[PDB]
Scaffold this active site. Structure first.
Site, PDB file in Angstrom:
ATOM      1  N   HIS A  17      -7.970  -7.383   2.507  1.00  0.00           N
ATOM      2  CA  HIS A  17      -6.534  -7.571   2.721  1.00  0.00           C
ATOM      3  C   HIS A  17      -6.282  -9.027   3.102  1.00  0.00           C
ATOM      4  O   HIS A  17      -7.097  -9.638   3.811  1.00  0.00           O
ATOM      5  CB  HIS A  17      -6.042  -6.644   3.844  1.00  0.00           C
TER       6      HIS A  17
ATOM      7  N   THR B 298       0.840  -1.218   0.000  1.00  0.00           N
ATOM      8  CA  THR B 298       0.000   0.000   0.000  1.00  0.00           C
ATOM      9  C   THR B 298       0.865   1.254   0.000  1.00  0.00           C
ATOM     10  O   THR B 298       0.556   2.222  -0.706  1.00  0.00           O
ATOM     11  CB  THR B 298      -0.922   0.097   1.246  1.00  0.00           C
TER      12      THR B 298
ATOM     13  N   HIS C 113      -2.697  -2.565  -5.547  1.00  0.00           N
ATOM     14  CA  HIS C 113      -1.777  -3.574  -6.081  1.00  0.00           C
ATOM     15  C   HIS C 113      -2.525  -4.900  -6.110  1.00  0.00           C
ATOM     16  O   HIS C 113      -3.646  -4.991  -5.615  1.00  0.00           O
ATOM     17  CB  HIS C 113      -0.522  -3.691  -5.207  1.00  0.00           C
TER      18      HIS C 113
HETATM   19  O1  LIG Z   1       0.501  -2.424   2.612  1.00  0.00           O
HETATM   20  P1  LIG Z   1      -0.592  -3.451   2.797  1.00  0.00           P
HETATM   21  O2  LIG Z   1      -0.200  -4.624   3.665  1.00  0.00           O
HETATM   22  O3  LIG Z   1      -1.339  -3.869   1.543  1.00  0.00           O
HETATM   23  O4  LIG Z   1      -1.749  -2.662   3.633  1.00  0.00           O
HETATM   24  C1  LIG Z   1      -1.598  -2.331   5.042  1.00  0.00           C
HETATM   25  C2  LIG Z   1      -2.163  -1.213   5.547  1.00  0.00           C
HETATM   26  O5  LIG Z   1      -2.570  -0.260   4.695  1.00  0.00           O
HETATM   27  C3  LIG Z   1      -2.072  -0.994   6.882  1.00  0.00           C
HETATM   28  O6  LIG Z   1      -2.561   0.094   7.489  1.00  0.00           O
HETATM   29 MN   LIG Z   2      -2.359  -2.714   0.073  1.00  0.00          MN
END
Ligand SMILES: O=P([O-])([O-])OC[C@H](O)CO
Ligand SMILES: [Mn+2]
EC number: 2.7.8.-
Length: 424
Positions: free
Chosen positions: A199, A83, A259
Site C-alpha cells: 500500500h 479497496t 486497483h
Molecule cells: O482503500 P485502500 O487505501 O487501498 O486500502 C486501505 C485499507 O484496506 C485499510 O484497511
Molecule cells: Mn486498496
C-alpha cells in the site's frame, strides 16, 4: 421508487448469460477462498528488476501450468473508495460511486450480496479477515448489510511494533495467522483475506525486504518493487500452508488485485521502469489488475477474455450451481460463452477486445494507435457503458433494493450480525 427499481431490473436482463455446462455447479458447496492483493498491477508479472523476478510465485501461477486460470486482460473498475470500491463490486456486481466511497456513504443501504446468497442457497458461512481495525472504510456497518458472518479484524492479530508496517499488520504474519483461523472453520465457508503491506507509500523495513528497489528516483515506484515482492512471498507461503492444512485441493481459490497502485503522477519513472512512454492509452492498459482462479477438478490455463471485477459475482454463483436470473447484476459469468466482453471504467472510459476509449478518443488495442473511423459497435458500447454507470448509481442513490421482493432472496436483517472483539 418501486418503478425506479423496475427500470434497473429490466435494464439488467438482456445481458444475462447461461452457465457453461463444463463449469455449472462444479464447485457446489465447496469452500471458496478469495485473496485480495493490495494495489497489485499485472505489469509486475514476469517483470525483473536488477535481474530478479519481482513476483516469482505469481509468475508461476500466471503461466497457466499451476492449477490456476489466469486472466491477463482483467481490470478493476474502482474510484475514490479504493479497496472499499473493489470489495463493493466483488460482492455485489455493482459499481461504486463516481465520487466518494459507497462503503462510507451507502453503508446502511439494502443489499442482495454474494455472501448472503451463498448462505441462503447453500449454507455457506462467510468471513473477512484483515489486519486493520473494523470501522475503517465503514466495514463494520457495511458487512452486516452484506450478510457477512464473521470479521476477523486487527483485534484477531498481534499488532505489536515488530508485526506492523505502514497501515497495520504485515502480510506474512497476516497470511500465517489467517490460514490457522481458516483451518478451524466449519465447511462450507466463503473466506476473503484482504492484504495491507503493498500500500502507498510502499514502505518496507530493510530487514523484511528480499529484493533491492528499482533505481528510477521515484520513491513510490522504487518502493513498490519491494512491497510487491514481499506480498508475492507472503502469498507463496500462504498456499503452502493451505496444502499442509488440507484446504487447497478442494477449495475454489481466487486471487485478484484490487486497483492500480501507481498513478499517472509517476509517468516519468514508469517510463524508465517499463521502457515505454506512459501515454493515456498505455496507462489504461496498466490498469490490468489480474484475476486467477483455481477450480477443483479443472485444469488451469490462460483465458484472454477482457473482463472486469463486476464479472466475478455471476462467475462464482454459476460455479456453485445457483440460478442468477433474479439477481440485479451488471456483470456476466467469465466462463459463459456469452460473457459480455465490454469493461466500463468509473470515469466513463472503457475497453473491449479490439479497442479502448480513453478521454474521448478511440485507440486500437494492438498498438495503442488512434482510431479515426468509429468501430461498428462503438455507439452501442459507449451507450452501454454510460447507462451501466447511471443505472448502478440509481440503485445506490435510491437505495432501490428496499423495493425488491426477490423470489430468490430473503431480506437481510443487519442487526443479526455482530463482530466481536478478537482475543488479541
Ligand atoms: O482503500 P485502500 O487505501 O487501498 O486500502 C486501505 C485499507 O484496506 C485499510 O484497511
Ligand atoms: Mn486498496
Amino acid at each position: 421508487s418501486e418503478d425506479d427499481l423496475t427500470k434497473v431490473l429490466n435494464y439488467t436482463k438482456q445481458r444475462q448469460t447461461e452457465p457453461n455446462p463444463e463449469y455449472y455447479g462444479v464447485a457446489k458447496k465447496k469452500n471458496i477462498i478469495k485473496i485480495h492483493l493490495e494495489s497489485f498491477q499485472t505489469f509486475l508479472i514476469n517483470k525483473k528488476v536488477n535481474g530478479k523476478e519481482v513476483t516469482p510465485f505469481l509468475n508461476k501461477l500466471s503461466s497457466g501450468k499451476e492449477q490456476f486460470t489466469y486472466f491477463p486482460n482483467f481490470f478493476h473498475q474502482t474510484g475514490q473508495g479504493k479497496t472499499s470500491d473493489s470489495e463493493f463490486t466483488m460482492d455485489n456486481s455493482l459499481y461504486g460511486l463516481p465520487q466518494g466511497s459507497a462503503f462510507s456513504l451507502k453503508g446502511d443501504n439494502t443489499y442482495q450480496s454474494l455472501p448472503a446468497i451463498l448462505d441462503q442457497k447453500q449454507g455457506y458461512k462467510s468471513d473477512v479477515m484483515h489486519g486493520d481495525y473494523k470501522t475503517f472504510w465503514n466495514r463494520d456497518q457495511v458487512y452486516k448489510h452484506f450478510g457477512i458472518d464473521k470479521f476477523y479484524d486487527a483485534t484477531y492479530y498481534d499488532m505489536s511494533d515488530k508485526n506492523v508496517v505502514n497501515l497495520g499488520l504485515k502480510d506474512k504474519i497476516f497470511f500465517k495467522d489467517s490460514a490457522n483461523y481458516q483451518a478451524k472453520m466449519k465447511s462450507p465457508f466463503y473466506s476473503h483475506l484482504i492484504t495491507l503491506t503493498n500500500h502507498y507509500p510502499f514502505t518496507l523495513d530493510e530487514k523484511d525486504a528480499t529484493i533491492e528497489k528499482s533505481n528510477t528516483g521515484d520513491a513510490t515506484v522504487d518502493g513498490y518493487i519491494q512491497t510487491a515482492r514481499y506480498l508475492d512471498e507472503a502469498l507463496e507461503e500462504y498456499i503452502n500452508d493451505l496444502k499442509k492444512k488440507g484446504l487447497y485441493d478442494n477449495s475454489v481459490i481466487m486471487i485478484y488485485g484490487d486497483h492500480y497502485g501507481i498513478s499517472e503522477n509517476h509517468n516519468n519513472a514508469m517510463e524508465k521502469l517499463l521502457g515505454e512512454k506512459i501515454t493515456p492509452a498505455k496507462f489504461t492498459d496498466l490498469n490490468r489488475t489480474g484475476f486467477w482462479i483455481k477450480i477443483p477438478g479443472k485444469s488451469g490455463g490462460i483465458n484472454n477474455e477482457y473482463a472486469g471485477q463486476v464479472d466475478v459475482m455471476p462467475t462464482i454463483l454459476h460455479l456453485a450451481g445457483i440460478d442468477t436470473k433474479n439477481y440485479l447484476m451488471f456483470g456476466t459469468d467469465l466462463f459463459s460463452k456469452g460473457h459480455n466482453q465490454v469493461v466500463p471504467f468509473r470515469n466513463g472510459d472503457f475497453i473491449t477486445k479490439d479497442y479502448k476509449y480513453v478521454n474521448g478518443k478511440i485507440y486500437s488495442n494492438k498498438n495503442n494507435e488512434l482510431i479515426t473511423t468509429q468501430p461498428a459497435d462503438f455507439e452501442k458500447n459507449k451507450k452501454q457503458v454510460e447507462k451501466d454507470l447511471e443505472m448502478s448509481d440509481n440503485v445506490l442513490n435510491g437505495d432501490l433494493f428496499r423495493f425488491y421482493k426477490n423470489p430468490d432472496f430473503k431480506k437481510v436483517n443487519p442487526s443479526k450480525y455482530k463482530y466481536e472483539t478478537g482475543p488479541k
